[PDB]
Amino acid sequence: KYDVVIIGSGPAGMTAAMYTARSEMKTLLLERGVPGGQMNNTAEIENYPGYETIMGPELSMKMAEPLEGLGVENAYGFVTGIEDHGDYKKIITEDDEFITKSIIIATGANHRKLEIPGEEEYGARGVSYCAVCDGAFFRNQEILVIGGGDSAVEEALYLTRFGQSVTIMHRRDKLRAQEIIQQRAFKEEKINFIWDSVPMEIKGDDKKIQSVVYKNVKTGEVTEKAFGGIFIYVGLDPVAEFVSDLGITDEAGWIITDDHMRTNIPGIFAVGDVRQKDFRQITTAVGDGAQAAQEAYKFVVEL
Amino acid sequence: KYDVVIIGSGPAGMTAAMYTARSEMKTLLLERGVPGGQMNNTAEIENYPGYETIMGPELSMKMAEPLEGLGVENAYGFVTGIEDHGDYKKIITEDDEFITKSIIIATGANHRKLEIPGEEEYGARGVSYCAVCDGAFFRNQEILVIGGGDSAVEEALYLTRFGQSVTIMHRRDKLRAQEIIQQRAFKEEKINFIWDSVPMEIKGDDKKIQSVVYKNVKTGEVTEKAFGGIFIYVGLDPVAEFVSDLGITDEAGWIITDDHMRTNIPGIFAVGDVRQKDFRQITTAVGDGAQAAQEAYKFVVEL
Numbered sequence A, B: 001k002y003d004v005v006i007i008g009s010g011p012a013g014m015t016a017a018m019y020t021a022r023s024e025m026k027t028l029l030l031e032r033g034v035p036g037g038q039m040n041n042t043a044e045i046e047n048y049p050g051y052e053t054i055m056g057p058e059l060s061m062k063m064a065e066p067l068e069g070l071g072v073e074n075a076y077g078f079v080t081g082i083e084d085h086g087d088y089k090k091i092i093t094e095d096d097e098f099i100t101k102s103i104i105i106a107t108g109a110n111h112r113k114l115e116i117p118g119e120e121e122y123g124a125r126g127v128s129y130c131a132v133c134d135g136a137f138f139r140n141q142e143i144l145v146i147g148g149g150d151s152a153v154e155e156a157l158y159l160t161r162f163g164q165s166v167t168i169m170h171r172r173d174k175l176r177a178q179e180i181i182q183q184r185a186f187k188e189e190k191i192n193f194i195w196d197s198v199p200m201e202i203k204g205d206d207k208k209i210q211s212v213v214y215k216n217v218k219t220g221e222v223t224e225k226a227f228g229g230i231f232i233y234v235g236l237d238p239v240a241e242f243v244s245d246l247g248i249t250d251e252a253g254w255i256i257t258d259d260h261m262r263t264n265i266p267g268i269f270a271v272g273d274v275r276q277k278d279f280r281q282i283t284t285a286v287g288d289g290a291q292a293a294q295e296a297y298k299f300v301v302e303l
């Protein structure tokens, strides 16, 4: 009944959907939230070819805008499962089922947790995984950012608009982030570093975070220091719960594809951050999206 | 001496260069012409995620703009050859040589010729491979467009601004172009079709084209019809002459990479339209560009 259903309306799904619709495939784009995916949780995007800088939520709106006119059917849906019925597939959401010849899974990734004490307890009250979402609640605080990658370092630089200071705690003595971003953080007077360290406990009073205990990974030295907020950027986990059963994921839960975005299962493709891969960017999300869309057309043409 | 040299400043090279520069790699971007590559020969781009429509040359300027500020060294160069010296490589242009640890080849593709009589003879005087370049010279003419793909059908639709009529001659009875573009051409009153046909001869007077002879591929029927211009869109050939010797191309001349944009030769990558692949789009150019850029960084880090 659908030629293709695309699950998730971040940049990978939005690209796939634009391409399927332009092939005049009967296209459903399901999204549980706001179109844009992780881009809506991004302050400034500097490395999307075509824009010198752009706010994440504006890029999300720009990518979503043409879809309706192209004939993509945009619908609300949280997908809970997928069933392969050979020559068609069924997609189950909270309330609905959809039948389709092909599926492109574009559900992205989610913040990894530290799995330390206080992390759950201070959820709404000093612990955050989204700087653009939460930053302004921390005006004039001493903010802590955990991690050493692109997100941690970029989001620390963003947070310097709000905090008195921002400290980046990284578990080694060399960041992973792109060098241009490292150098910006090195130079920024309001960014401090706690190198070779990991957080052990987040502590607070009845109602908000007050301090963080941490440990040096070369010496075991343990320090407790006062902070007003903690933003955690320690990597990603796959958002692929609805395919756990299907035999298309690796040991960590990422969806395995070949170079044409195909899974094991004919007519089920995956694109973007949800895939097993190393390089998670908007550029490669878009690329993947386009490739899967062409592969889905071909698959359905053959069917 | 360079960490990376990127050869060609279309969207694949421009993306690669942006990414290498952001990794603080000493980056040279050589281009023989104008930044933008095939995008400068494109009228309206509707399917680049982030823009609902944009003129090709404007998208080219937008993609080129940040490069200087990021520290990419933009230089004129026509590359004539590359020599692999194990732990470095040499790149030869008309007048220069450049030594580099890594290379990303992003030189794209060029219009395939019909290799028919009159095609060379009427080069500047009715025969064209670029509608945005030449279209306005054909105001009020009966224009012919040869081919059945995305370029032929899109460029025919563009040319209807100028010609009295535009006729698309395709060698089968079904176009290859994206269905949205086919349907637009079907509906457009100024587009005619010559199905199941190929051009055999382009004829003219001393000074300009006047007519085209063609043949039906199912019946052999031969017809001669008057036209004022002919635009040819019969596919692509690789732009890879400078690596013919190196063992990295297929029988047609396309550069063979794996999924991480690597050729045979360590530290030589290829991206975008020049690669052996099926799906040549700006989206996948950009994706390839980004992937190669991350692979080059890693390669050079290791070296």
Ligand SMILES: Cc1cc2nc3c(=O)[nH]c(=O)nc-3n(C[C@H](O)[C@H](O)[C@H](O)COP(=O)(O)OP(=O)(O)OC[C@H]3O[C@@H](n4cnc5c(N)ncnc54)[C@H](O)[C@@H]3O)c2cc1C
Pocket (backbone or CB within 6 Å): A007, A008, A009, A010, A011, A012, A013, A030, A031, A032, A033, A034, A035, A036, A037, A038, A039, A041, A042, A043, A044, A045, A046, A047, A048, A077, A078, A079, A080, A106, A107, A108, A109, A151, A154, A155, A239, A242, A271, A272, A273, A274, A280, A281, A282, A283, A285
């Ligand atoms: C803070 C931060 C800054 C970043 N900055 C940049 C940058 O500057 N440049 C860059 O290139 N990359 C950047 N990235 C990476 C970039 O945002 C991602 O690579 C890209 O968004 C991934 O796109 P995607 O479409 O694969 O996944 P996503 O954007 O993750 O979208 C997945 C979508 O699927 C939906 N979804 C999930 N599960 C379901 C379900 N079960 N049913 C329905 N819908 C579901 C989600 O709601 C989401 O909208 C950044 C990431 C972060 C966190």
Ligand SMILES: Cc1cc2nc3c(=O)[nH]c(=O)nc-3n(C[C@H](O)[C@H](O)[C@H](O)COP(=O)(O)OP(=O)(O)OC[C@H]3O[C@@H](n4cnc5c(N)ncnc54)[C@H](O)[C@@H]3O)c2cc1C
Pocket (backbone or CB within 6 Å): B007, B008, B009, B010, B011, B012, B013, B030, B031, B032, B033, B034, B035, B036, B037, B038, B039, B041, B042, B043, B044, B045, B046, B047, B048, B077, B078, B079, B080, B106, B107, B108, B109, B151, B154, B155, B239, B242, B271, B272, B273, B274, B280, B281, B282, B283, B285
């Ligand atoms: C008429 C037309 C319309 C199109 N419309 C669209 C569209 O709407 N959407 C879309 O997604 N795709 C479209 N495309 C496809 C898109 O333009 C290409 O996929 C994309 O430009 C390829 O980028 P690239 O960087 O790999 O190659 P290119 O853009 O081909 O750039 C290659 C560059 O390398 C340079 N170069 C070549 N040889 C050398 C040398 N020896 N030394 C130095 N420099 C050299 C060239 O000057 C060029 O600037 C269109 C193509 C055409 C022809």
Ligand SMILES: NC(=O)c1ccc[n+]([C@@H]2O[C@H](COP(=O)([O-])OP(=O)(O)OC[C@H]3O[C@@H](n4cnc5c(N)ncnc54)[C@H](OP(=O)(O)O)[C@@H]3O)[C@@H](O)[C@H]2O)c1
Pocket (backbone or CB within 6 Å): A047, A114, A146, A147, A148, A149, A150, A151, A152, A154, A169, A170, A171, A172, A175, A176, A177, A197, A198, A199, A233, A234, A235, A236, A278, A279, A280, A281
């Ligand atoms: N501008 C952009 O292009 C952009 C922006 C944001 C994100 N992204 C991409 O999105 C993906 C996710 O990036 P990310 O930064 O979110 O994740 P990431 O690359 O996995 O980096 C996580 C960082 O946190 C460190 N870390 C992990 N556990 C830690 C702990 N317990 N204590 C302290 N530090 C810890 C990691 O250490 P190690 O380095 O030791 O592993 C790593 O440096 C990446 O591929 C990234 O490039 C891109």
Ligand SMILES: NC(=O)c1ccc[n+]([C@@H]2O[C@H](COP(=O)([O-])OP(=O)(O)OC[C@H]3O[C@@H](n4cnc5c(N)ncnc54)[C@H](OP(=O)(O)O)[C@@H]3O)[C@@H](O)[C@H]2O)c1
Pocket (backbone or CB within 6 Å): B047, B114, B146, B147, B148, B149, B150, B151, B152, B154, B169, B170, B171, B172, B175, B176, B177, B197, B198, B199, B233, B234, B235, B236, B278, B279, B280, B281
């Ligand atoms: N909007 C966009 O995304 C966009 C726009 C332009 C181009 N592109 C991409 O750029 C690449 C190049 O596209 P293209 O259209 O330039 O090339 P293409 O896809 O190779 O199509 C060439 C067309 O001409 C036909 N043909 C070949 N020889 C012919 C002859 N002698 N007489 C009449 N017709 C003939 C082919 O026939 P058969 O079909 O029988 O082979 C084909 O339909 C493609 O991957 C394309 O999708 C994309």
